[PDB]
């Protein structure tokens, strides 16, 4: 006997971070190509040493080193795809059968031995 059954807010904040980083760094550089500062910081956010030119101020190169921010956000969305993606009743047992309900429907063939 067997039973047959029928078969978002992160992007805006990091964009504000890109914008604030670019304007603050090149204002500090001009005190002691801002469209290009936007495009440079945007391209190195996108895991790409963009263009050909490093900033001649070494401090902005150090800040490009510490902003490993593209790598850690790569790590976070790979953890998300490890979590959001793939990661995740026998008739002998209880769950819906020994204490059943009408949402689980039962039938046999009438005038038979079962």
């Amino acid at each position: 006997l067997t039973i047959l059954v029928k078969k978002s807010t992160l992007w805006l904040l990091v964009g504000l971070s890109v914008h604030v980083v670019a304007v603050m760094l090149y204002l500090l550089d001009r005190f002691s190509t801002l469209s290009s500062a936007m495009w440079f910081s945007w391209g190195v956010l996108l895991n790409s040493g963009i263009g050909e030119g490093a900033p001649r101020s070494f401090s902005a190169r150090i800040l490009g080193m510490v902003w490993g921010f593209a790598m850690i956000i790569v790590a976070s969305y790979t953890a998300n795809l490890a979590a959001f993606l793939v990661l995740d009743i026998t008739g002998i047992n209880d769950p819906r059968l020994r204490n059943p309900s009408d949402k689980f429907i039962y039938a046999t063939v009438k005038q038979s031995s079962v």
């Binding site: 040493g49 401090s59 150090i62 510490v66 790598m71 790590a75 990661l87």
Partner: protein
């Protein structure tokens, strides 16, 4: 023969000679940085090693381009041996990134409320919404023991058990104080898995279940021996195998990254202030 929660006064009134089924009283209510640094310290040691060695191989755009290129090894000349060093430590970079992605994928796989919320008089963040039954020993015990909670609880009286079940189920009520073992059978009764309080195994009483007989008769010693035998025969385990069956049996890491971002930001700001000072020397 109806199973009763044994207090002093039921033992005062009648005779108890039964090994009881124990129970108590409850209330129905409705990280990747040990892994970086252990790799990161050997990584920075290796960084100092390879920077010193790559300076040594070109005893022949220099002092700052080198360590930038070492950081760009992970962040994907004319000395051919320098390109060999780039090749080997880039293989090191990709194997370390693969092992760390495997490590983060490996990571990818309320009991003390009785005083601070309920015994604590007159305040919680919502107002008090408790549940009674207008009989039973639980009401009497909280009456003679926690009379503040008794006064706060008796504001909302319930006409049985299922009225409180549907009020907690609709969220109209927040608390319903009852004998806990009936709620443990209710753990094997509800299917929606909005189920049962704390589940720590700790009930906030220690009483039992059994039979009341007449005091000072010629009585029923053999029934006590027989029920202890049926206990020892595992027939209680048979009985729960009959009836007691069951059904249901971020933000902080992002802010913790952003706080270290702000700390490195302040470090770079005071570094720039010092470098702005350093033409005055």
């Amino acid at each position: 023969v109806g199973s009763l929660t044994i207090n002093e006064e039921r033992s005062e009134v009648v005779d108890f000679s039964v090994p009881f089924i124990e129970t108590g009283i409850s209330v129905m209510v409705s990280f990747l940085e040990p892994f970086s640094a252990c790799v990161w310290v050997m990584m920075f040691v290796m960084l100092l090693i390879v920077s010193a060695v790559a300076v040594f191989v070109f005893e022949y755009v220099t002092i700052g381009k080198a360590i930038w290129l070492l950081w760009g090894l992970v962040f994907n000349p004319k000395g051919t041996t320098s390109k060999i060093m780039v090749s080997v430590w880039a293989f090191f970079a990709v194997i370390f990134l693969a092992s760390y992605t495997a490590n983060l994928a490996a990571f990818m796989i309320v009991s003390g409320l009785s005083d601070k919320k309920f015994q604590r008089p007159n305040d919680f963040s919502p107002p008090f919404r408790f549940g009674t039954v207008p009989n039973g020993s639980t009401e009497r015990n909280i009456r003679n023991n926690y009379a503040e909670m008794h006064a706060y609880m008796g504001k909302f009286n319930q006409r049985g058990v299922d009225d409180a079940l549907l009020s907690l189920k609709t969220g109209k009520l927040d608390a319903f104080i009852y004998d806990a073992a009936v709620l443990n059978y209710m753990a094997g009764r509800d299917e929606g898995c909005k189920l049962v309080t704390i589940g720590s195994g700790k009930v906030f009483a220690s009483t039992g279940y059994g039979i009341a007989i007449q005091k000072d008769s010629g009585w029923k010693r053999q029934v006590d021996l027989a029920i202890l035998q049926l206990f020892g025969d595992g027939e209680m385990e048979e009985l729960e195998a009959l009836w007691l069956t069951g059904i249901c049996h971020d933000i902080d890491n992002m802010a913790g990254v952003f706080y270290m971002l702000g700390a490195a930001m302040a470090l770079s700001l005071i570094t720039f202030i010092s470098e702005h000072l350093f033409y005055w020397q």
